[PDB]
Design a protein around this nucleic acid. Structure first.
Ligand SMILES: [Mg+2]
Ligand SMILES: [Mg+2]
Ligand SMILES: [Mg+2]
Ligand SMILES: [Mg+2]
Ligand SMILES: [Mg+2]
Ligand SMILES: [Mg+2]
Ligand SMILES: [Mg+2]
Ligand SMILES: [Mg+2]
Ligand SMILES: [Mg+2]
Ligand SMILES: [Mg+2]
Ligand SMILES: [Mg+2]
Ligand SMILES: [Mg+2]
Ligand SMILES: [Mg+2]
Ligand SMILES: [Mg+2]
Ligand SMILES: [Mg+2]
Ligand SMILES: [Mg+2]
Ligand SMILES: [Mg+2]
Ligand SMILES: [Mg+2]
Ligand SMILES: [Mg+2]
Ligand SMILES: [Mg+2]
Ligand SMILES: [Mg+2]
Ligand SMILES: [Mg+2]
Ligand SMILES: [Mg+2]
Ligand SMILES: [Mg+2]
Ligand SMILES: [Mg+2]
Ligand SMILES: [Mg+2]
Ligand SMILES: [Mg+2]
Ligand SMILES: [Mg+2]
Ligand SMILES: [Mg+2]
Ligand SMILES: [Mg+2]
Ligand SMILES: [Mg+2]
Ligand SMILES: [Mg+2]
Ligand SMILES: [Mg+2]
Ligand SMILES: [Mg+2]
Ligand SMILES: [Mg+2]
Ligand SMILES: [Mg+2]
Ligand SMILES: [Mg+2]
Ligand SMILES: [Mg+2]
Ligand SMILES: [Mg+2]
Ligand SMILES: [Mg+2]
Ligand SMILES: [Mg+2]
Ligand SMILES: [Mg+2]
Ligand SMILES: [Mg+2]
Ligand SMILES: [Mg+2]
Ligand SMILES: [Mg+2]
Ligand SMILES: [Mg+2]
Ligand SMILES: [Mg+2]
Ligand SMILES: [Mg+2]
Ligand SMILES: [Mg+2]
Ligand SMILES: [Mg+2]
Ligand SMILES: [Mg+2]
Ligand SMILES: [Mg+2]
Ligand SMILES: [Mg+2]
Ligand SMILES: [Mg+2]
Ligand SMILES: [Mg+2]
Ligand SMILES: [Mg+2]
Ligand SMILES: [Mg+2]
Ligand SMILES: [Mg+2]
Ligand SMILES: [Mg+2]
Ligand SMILES: [Mg+2]
Ligand SMILES: [Mg+2]
Ligand SMILES: [Mg+2]
Ligand SMILES: [Mg+2]
Ligand SMILES: [Mg+2]
Ligand SMILES: [Mg+2]
Ligand SMILES: [Mg+2]
Ligand SMILES: [Mg+2]
Ligand SMILES: [Mg+2]
Ligand SMILES: [Mg+2]
Ligand SMILES: [Mg+2]
Ligand SMILES: [Mg+2]
Ligand SMILES: [Mg+2]
Ligand SMILES: [Mg+2]
Ligand SMILES: [Mg+2]
Ligand SMILES: [Mg+2]
Ligand SMILES: [Mg+2]
Ligand SMILES: [Mg+2]
Ligand SMILES: [Mg+2]
Ligand SMILES: [Mg+2]
Ligand SMILES: [Mg+2]
Ligand SMILES: [Mg+2]
Ligand SMILES: [Mg+2]
Ligand SMILES: [Mg+2]
Ligand SMILES: [Mg+2]
Ligand SMILES: [Mg+2]
Ligand SMILES: [Mg+2]
Ligand SMILES: [Mg+2]
Ligand SMILES: [Mg+2]
Ligand SMILES: [Mg+2]
Ligand SMILES: [Mg+2]
Ligand SMILES: [Mg+2]
Ligand SMILES: [Mg+2]
Ligand SMILES: [Mg+2]
Ligand SMILES: [Mg+2]
Ligand SMILES: [Mg+2]
Ligand SMILES: [Mg+2]
Ligand SMILES: [Mg+2]
Ligand SMILES: [Mg+2]
Ligand SMILES: [Mg+2]
Ligand SMILES: [Mg+2]
Ligand SMILES: [Mg+2]
Ligand SMILES: [Mg+2]
Ligand SMILES: [Mg+2]
Ligand SMILES: [Mg+2]
Ligand SMILES: [Mg+2]
Ligand SMILES: [Mg+2]
Ligand SMILES: [Mg+2]
Ligand SMILES: [Mg+2]
Ligand SMILES: [Mg+2]
Ligand SMILES: [Mg+2]
Ligand SMILES: [Mg+2]
Ligand SMILES: [Mg+2]
Ligand SMILES: [Mg+2]
Ligand SMILES: [Mg+2]
Ligand SMILES: [Mg+2]
Ligand SMILES: [Mg+2]
Ligand SMILES: [Mg+2]
Ligand SMILES: [Mg+2]
Ligand SMILES: [Mg+2]
Ligand SMILES: [Mg+2]
Ligand SMILES: [Mg+2]
Ligand SMILES: [Mg+2]
Ligand SMILES: [Mg+2]
Ligand SMILES: [Mg+2]
Ligand SMILES: [Mg+2]
Ligand SMILES: [Mg+2]
Ligand SMILES: [Mg+2]
Ligand SMILES: [Mg+2]
Ligand SMILES: [Mg+2]
Ligand SMILES: [Mg+2]
Ligand SMILES: [Mg+2]
Ligand SMILES: [Mg+2]
Ligand SMILES: [Mg+2]
Ligand SMILES: [Mg+2]
Ligand SMILES: [Mg+2]
Ligand SMILES: [Mg+2]
Ligand SMILES: [Mg+2]
Ligand SMILES: [Mg+2]
Ligand SMILES: [Mg+2]
Ligand SMILES: [Mg+2]
Ligand SMILES: [Mg+2]
Ligand SMILES: [Mg+2]
Ligand SMILES: [Mg+2]
Ligand SMILES: [Mg+2]
Ligand SMILES: [Mg+2]
Ligand SMILES: [Mg+2]
Ligand SMILES: [Mg+2]
Ligand SMILES: [Mg+2]
Ligand SMILES: [Mg+2]
Ligand SMILES: [Mg+2]
Ligand SMILES: [Mg+2]
Ligand SMILES: [Mg+2]
Ligand SMILES: [Mg+2]
Ligand SMILES: [Mg+2]
Ligand SMILES: [Mg+2]
Ligand SMILES: [Mg+2]
Ligand SMILES: [Mg+2]
Ligand SMILES: [Mg+2]
Ligand SMILES: [Mg+2]
Ligand SMILES: [Mg+2]
Ligand SMILES: [Mg+2]
Ligand SMILES: [Mg+2]
Ligand SMILES: [Mg+2]
Ligand SMILES: [Mg+2]
Ligand SMILES: [Mg+2]
Ligand SMILES: [Mg+2]
Ligand SMILES: [Mg+2]
Ligand SMILES: [Mg+2]
Ligand SMILES: [Mg+2]
Ligand SMILES: [Mg+2]
Ligand SMILES: [Mg+2]
Lengths: 117, 146, 63, 202
RNA sequence: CUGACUGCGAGGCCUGCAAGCCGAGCAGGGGCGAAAGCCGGGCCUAGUGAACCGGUGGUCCCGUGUGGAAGGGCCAUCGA
RNA sequence: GAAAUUGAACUGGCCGUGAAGAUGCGGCCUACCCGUGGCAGGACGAAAAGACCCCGUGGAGCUUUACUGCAGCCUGGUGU
RNA sequence: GCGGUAGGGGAGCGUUCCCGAUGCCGAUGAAGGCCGACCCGCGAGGGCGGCUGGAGGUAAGGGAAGUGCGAAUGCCGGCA
RNA sequence: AAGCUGUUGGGAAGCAGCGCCAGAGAGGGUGAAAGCCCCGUAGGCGAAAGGUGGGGGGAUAGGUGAGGGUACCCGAGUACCCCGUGGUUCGUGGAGCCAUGGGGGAAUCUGGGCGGACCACCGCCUAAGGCUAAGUACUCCGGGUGACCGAUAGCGCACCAGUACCGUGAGGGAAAGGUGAAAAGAACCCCGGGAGGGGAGUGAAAUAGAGCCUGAAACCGUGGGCUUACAAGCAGUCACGGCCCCGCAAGGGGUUGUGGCGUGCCUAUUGAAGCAUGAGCCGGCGACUCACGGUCGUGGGCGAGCUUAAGCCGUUGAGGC
RNA sequence: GCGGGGGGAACCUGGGGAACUGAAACAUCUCAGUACCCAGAGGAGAGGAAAGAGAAAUCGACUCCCUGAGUAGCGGCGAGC
């Protein structure tokens, strides 16, 4: 019993090519270049899925430090006081209160200040 | 019952290892990976190194043979009387070759441990111990002659 | 097709009733000149092997 | 198992026979496999790089050619050229142990008997080798086509009459084998055929 | 005076293999000593070579229809 | 209306880095998008699975007081 | 407890072909093709929906291999 | 051998209805899926002529007996021995037997060879003349059958192939199958020198228009949505934003502006992003098999036993001896 | 007057007769009387009525298959046969 390659090799190829669309040049038309670029893309995606955390942490931290420096202290003093006050509150992100409702942010500044020392 | 599932009772799996793929036995395919993995290794059974084999041993096994070679001679087949004790009456090489223990080795010769039955027995030879154990039970004639 | 036995092997090696392989003690034919009587007795006997022992079996087996 | 129904022109009396109760499906698997693998016939063929019809000359020097590096065109890397490990003619049949065969056979008849579908007969009104007669007689035996039937008897005429029928398969007593037993849902056969069946094993 | 013995060898050292090395003790028969005992070569570590092949002596063996003989095996020793 | 060539290209300089000889890495500098006509410094530019060198218990040609053979010639006996 | 090359082990996916087939599916449209942001599986993959196409296809459960390609300055063809 | 009606369709063999034959429910064709439409199938029947024909029947050629006595005959440069070799499992080996190029060279049954040097004994056989079917091998040819191929496969050749073409020559050696049920192969009009098209017409379909079924990928074009001319890039990825689009909703698809990050794939390597190797791109072919014999494991049958090989019987996917 | 001549895919017999390769070099050996050249044969060919086998006072022309048997043996007693 013989079995040619048949549909198979095309189907598989087509599948990979389906992801390739959007890419520049042969890299999206040719199966081979498509495969390679898809590999690199997969790895980049996996890595940046961890990068996203660091990036957002940093952005938040900058904003927090800015609005905190509006009141008189720096981010280091802020977190020292806040963690010393007992408020394990606010996954740093939720200090977005710098933007909306900055009054709450100010009361938090005080509660950190007095409990700092 | 019908051809829907006489299927082999879940152990015989013909799953021969197909090594050509991208996962399982990729690229190098089967245990190879190096070189002199191509046509075929030299033996290895008895052979190789190119030194001296284990061939340093020696033939004490004399009488390996002459040109006319094998000298035909009456080959003696032994038989314990404990396997003979399975049945009883009066045995001859015919009965022993019929039972299963003889296989036309022809020259019969009872011997050995086990226990003796008082029955009679024709053979071609008799071991001492067997002759005595059977002497304490029954009678026994010697060979024909040839 | 149909493995021929290794004639060299059988002419110089005996397979045990259990499974081991037996050969004669080497060093008792050419090296003698005034070697002690201790030698020629201990070299007169036969002995086992080890892992080439397992190789040997393959070289027979119709035997 | 034992209490099988026997049909004859004088009533529906019964009978009994050995027929082991326990039935290993795997045994039927190996026997049927042996049968289908022996009825198999090797024939698939191909040609090696030497079984080809080409020349042997090295197609080009390989040195300084700039091209690849090749030998004769019979090589399997070439299109048209020899196949690599193509199938050659070979025998698929082997020797399944007789004990196993008679075993599986008696076990198949046994299972069919256990289901109750078995039926030993002697009444054959459909004398002449004609389909309609066997159709009426089958209408008598409760046969109808609802169940595929294996018929086994030494009678040539009955064989002929039942032969064309699609929901039935002809068979001689010596032709009795596990595959055909498994095929049909219901088994019907002669007293003589069942006698020689008992002669093989019983 | 000739234990530079014959028939062995429990148990190890070293070691991939093969090989090398140490050895109490048992039986036979002897050496020296009154005996206890010591002796299976030399204070010890190099002084050497698997196997195949052949020479010589020896012996419970095999020896092609049977008896011999040729030849072979085994034990001893020899040809790097 | 061709050709060798061609992994893909959105293909800059310096300084360093690194398999030490980077358009692709880091740092700094420079640069509007596309072409035409010219030069030949770089892309270790193209070309030939290095002709130098080494390796393979590879091949071939040649040599001789390497080995073993063969032709050819010399030679004793014998048949004619 | 779970980085992983050589390597060993386990569990699966798909292709062709046979039993299951005097069967079942198919003009109310088979195989193949094109499309998808939908469904299921960790994955190979299976399923559904629209379009094309026009005569074949093959369950559950088993069986057998010319059985899965990205590279060999691979082979043939097509086209830059 | 045994079929009509209704129905859907371009076309029925599909569908529905009742019905029929079967020693035929193999298969092929018929516009689509037919036991009953055609060709066949099961089962039967047939030769004036040619071939074959011990299977049977006849005929001929031919062959068939015991004891006594006689010394006539019984295969020649042969036996046998030696020299040089071949054959056999036998490579000179204790090397026989058979075969014979060279040399010596008999006997005719009280003879002669041989049974592994040679000898004795015990046995087998008649050399140096010839003939013979069957059982066995093969496949140019015919037929059957495939858990064999389906146009890069399968014979090199499904087709005007050992051709075209290459080579002085021996030789080398290809590609190339597909309208549709039916040609009904597109009249006539139109543009055009034609080629080629646009109507019209045939057809179920012309996206079946003639190297014409299905029409994949590279590659080349046209229109559209998004986007770019101060920007440094293995061309991606994550994030937010704008424009465009499907959707009540929330959401989702496409694109890419800015920002973060980012040294192609395989191979060979102590080590690669390497200025080490291989690939222009796409599609198809392409590489761990089978046979016998082992070895462990493994699912079963049997068990001091287990199993048959060639073959014969059976059948024509039936097994048994 | 009778016969011969040439051809035939493979098979068959006979007369000649290699090397790569194997031995992990190589010369005895191996591949092997295989490839091939030549002659001849016929639907087959060869072989065939014992101057035999070889241990049983046994078999009773030849060919082919299974087994004997990878035994007996052969062998730089190596490869291997
Ligand atoms: Mg393939
Ligand atoms: Mg994009
Ligand atoms: Mg954080
Ligand atoms: Mg792995
Ligand atoms: Mg790869
Ligand atoms: Mg290496
Ligand atoms: Mg090998
Ligand atoms: Mg020896
Ligand atoms: Mg004797
Ligand atoms: Mg016994
Ligand atoms: Mg020593
Ligand atoms: Mg000593
Ligand atoms: Mg001794
Ligand atoms: Mg010892
Ligand atoms: Mg060949
Ligand atoms: Mg060839
Ligand atoms: Mg050719
Ligand atoms: Mg060649
Ligand atoms: Mg090139
Ligand atoms: Mg009838
Ligand atoms: Mg029948
Ligand atoms: Mg001694
Ligand atoms: Mg010492
Ligand atoms: Mg001692
Ligand atoms: Mg004294
Ligand atoms: Mg003492
Ligand atoms: Mg001592
Ligand atoms: Mg000294
Ligand atoms: Mg001293
Ligand atoms: Mg040494
Ligand atoms: Mg010696
Ligand atoms: Mg000697
Ligand atoms: Mg003497
Ligand atoms: Mg003697
Ligand atoms: Mg003798
Ligand atoms: Mg000698
Ligand atoms: Mg001797
Ligand atoms: Mg490169
Ligand atoms: Mg850009
Ligand atoms: Mg500087
Ligand atoms: Mg620099
Ligand atoms: Mg630099
Ligand atoms: Mg970096
Ligand atoms: Mg840079
Ligand atoms: Mg370079
Ligand atoms: Mg340059
Ligand atoms: Mg080259
Ligand atoms: Mg090179
Ligand atoms: Mg080179
Ligand atoms: Mg050159
Ligand atoms: Mg090298
Ligand atoms: Mg060199
Ligand atoms: Mg060398
Ligand atoms: Mg070397
Ligand atoms: Mg060399
Ligand atoms: Mg070579
Ligand atoms: Mg050389
Ligand atoms: Mg040269
Ligand atoms: Mg040479
Ligand atoms: Mg020269
Ligand atoms: Mg020569
Ligand atoms: Mg001359
Ligand atoms: Mg002369
Ligand atoms: Mg002369
Ligand atoms: Mg781990
Ligand atoms: Mg892991
Ligand atoms: Mg590795
Ligand atoms: Mg197919
Ligand atoms: Mg089928
Ligand atoms: Mg079927
Ligand atoms: Mg329609
Ligand atoms: Mg319909
Ligand atoms: Mg429908
Ligand atoms: Mg449709
Ligand atoms: Mg349609
Ligand atoms: Mg298909
Ligand atoms: Mg399919
Ligand atoms: Mg479809
Ligand atoms: Mg799952
Ligand atoms: Mg999917
Ligand atoms: Mg899918
Ligand atoms: Mg679909
Ligand atoms: Mg059709
Ligand atoms: Mg299936
Ligand atoms: Mg590949
Ligand atoms: Mg490629
Ligand atoms: Mg190409
Ligand atoms: Mg071009
Ligand atoms: Mg009608
Ligand atoms: Mg009608
Ligand atoms: Mg209608
Ligand atoms: Mg109708
Ligand atoms: Mg039929
Ligand atoms: Mg048709
Ligand atoms: Mg069908
Ligand atoms: Mg019907
Ligand atoms: Mg007929
Ligand atoms: Mg007839
Ligand atoms: Mg007639
Ligand atoms: Mg006639
Ligand atoms: Mg006439
Ligand atoms: Mg007459
Ligand atoms: Mg007469
Ligand atoms: Mg004569
Ligand atoms: Mg003469
Ligand atoms: Mg004589
Ligand atoms: Mg000779
Ligand atoms: Mg001679
Ligand atoms: Mg010899
Ligand atoms: Mg005489
Ligand atoms: Mg005489
Ligand atoms: Mg004789
Ligand atoms: Mg003799
Ligand atoms: Mg005599
Ligand atoms: Mg003669
Ligand atoms: Mg014949
Ligand atoms: Mg045919
Ligand atoms: Mg078929
Ligand atoms: Mg074609
Ligand atoms: Mg095609
Ligand atoms: Mg093609
Ligand atoms: Mg032309
Ligand atoms: Mg030329
Ligand atoms: Mg020409
Ligand atoms: Mg070609
Ligand atoms: Mg048609
Ligand atoms: Mg027109
Ligand atoms: Mg004109
Ligand atoms: Mg249509
Ligand atoms: Mg349509
Ligand atoms: Mg035309
Ligand atoms: Mg078509
Ligand atoms: Mg088309
Ligand atoms: Mg088109
Ligand atoms: Mg297209
Ligand atoms: Mg815009
Ligand atoms: Mg500026
Ligand atoms: Mg950058
Ligand atoms: Mg706009
Ligand atoms: Mg972007
Ligand atoms: Mg912008
Ligand atoms: Mg970006
Ligand atoms: Mg290398
Ligand atoms: Mg470099
Ligand atoms: Mg280079
Ligand atoms: Mg290199
Ligand atoms: Mg490479
Ligand atoms: Mg390149
Ligand atoms: Mg490549
Ligand atoms: Mg390609
Ligand atoms: Mg393998
Ligand atoms: Mg093994
Ligand atoms: Mg083992
Ligand atoms: Mg298991
Ligand atoms: Mg069981
Ligand atoms: Mg078992
Ligand atoms: Mg058991
Ligand atoms: Mg067999
Ligand atoms: Mg066998
Ligand atoms: Mg048959
Ligand atoms: Mg029939
Ligand atoms: Mg022959
Ligand atoms: Mg070699
Ligand atoms: Mg050499
Ligand atoms: Mg050579
Ligand atoms: Mg020979
Ligand atoms: Mg003849
Ligand atoms: Mg005798
Ligand atoms: Mg006989
Ligand atoms: Mg006779
Ligand atoms: Mg030989």
């Amino acid at each position: 019993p013989r079995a040619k390659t048949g549909v198979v090799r095309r189907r598989k190829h087509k599948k990979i090519l389906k992801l390739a669309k959007g890419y520049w040049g042969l890299r999206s038309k040719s199966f081979r270049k498509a495969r390679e670029t898809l590999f690199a893309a997969g790895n980049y995606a996996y890595a940046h899925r961890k990068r996203r955390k660091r990036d957002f942490r940093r952005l938040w931290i900058v904003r927090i430090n800015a609005a905190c420096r509006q009141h008189g202290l720096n981010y280091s003093t802020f977190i020292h006081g806040l963690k010393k006050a007992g408020i394990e509150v606010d996954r740093k992100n939720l200090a977005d209160l710098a933007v909306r409702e900055p009054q709450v942010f100010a009361e938090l500044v005080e509660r950190a200040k007095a409990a700092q020392g | 019952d019908l051809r829907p599932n006489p299927g082999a009772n879940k152990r015989r799996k013909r799953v021969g290892r197909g090594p050509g793929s991208g996962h399982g036995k990729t690229a190098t395919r089967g245990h190879k990976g190096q070189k002199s993995r191509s046509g075929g290794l030299k033996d290895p059974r008895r052979f190789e190194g190119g030194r001296s084999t284990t061939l340093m041993r020696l033939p004490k096994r004399g009488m390996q043979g002459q040109v006319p070679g094998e000298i035909k001679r009456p080959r003696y087949q032994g038989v314990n009387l404990k396997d003979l004790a399975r049945f009883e009456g009066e045995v001859t090489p015919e009965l022993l070759v019929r039972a299963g223990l003889l296989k036309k080795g022809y020259r019969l010769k009872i011997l050995g441990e086990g226990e003796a039955k008082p029955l009679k027995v024709v053979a071609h030879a008799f071991s001492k111990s067997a002759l005595e154990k059977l002497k304490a039970a029954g009678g026994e004639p010697v060979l024909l002659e040839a | 097709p149909k493995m021929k036995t290794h004639k060299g092997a059988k002419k110089r090696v005996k397979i045990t009733a259990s499974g081991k392989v037996v050969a004669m003690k080497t060093g008792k034919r050419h090296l003698n000149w005034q070697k002690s009587g201790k030698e020629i007795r201990q070299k007169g006997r036969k002995f086992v092997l080890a892992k080439p022992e397992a190789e040997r079996i393959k070289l027979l087996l119709p035997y | 198992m034992y209490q099988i129904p026997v049909l004859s022109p004088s009533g529906r009396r019964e009978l009994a026979a050995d027929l082991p109760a326990e039935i290993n499906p795997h045994l039927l698997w190996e026997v049927v496999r042996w049968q289908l693998a022996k009825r198999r016939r090797g024939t698939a063929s191909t040609k090696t790089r030497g079984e080809v019809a080409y020349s042997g000359r090295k197609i080009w020097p390989q040195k300084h050619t700039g091209r690849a590096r090749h030998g004769d065109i019979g090589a399997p890397i070439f299109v048209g050229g020899g196949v690599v490990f193509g199938p050659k003619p070979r025998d698929y049949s082997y020797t399944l142990p007789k004990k196993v065969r008679k075993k599986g056979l008696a076990m198949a008849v046994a299972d069919r008997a256990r289901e109750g579908k078995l039926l030993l007969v002697e009444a054959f009104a459909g004398v002449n080798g004609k389909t309609k007669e066997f159709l009426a007689w089958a209408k008598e035996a409760g046969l109808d086509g609802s169940e595929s039937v294996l018929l086994v008897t030494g009678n040539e005429l009955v064989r002929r009459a039942a032969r064309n029928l699609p929901w039935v398969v002809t068979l001689a007593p010596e032709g009795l084998n596990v595959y055909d037993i498994v095929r049909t849902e219901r088994l019907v056969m002669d007293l003589d055929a069942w006698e020689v069946f008992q002669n093989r094993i019983g």
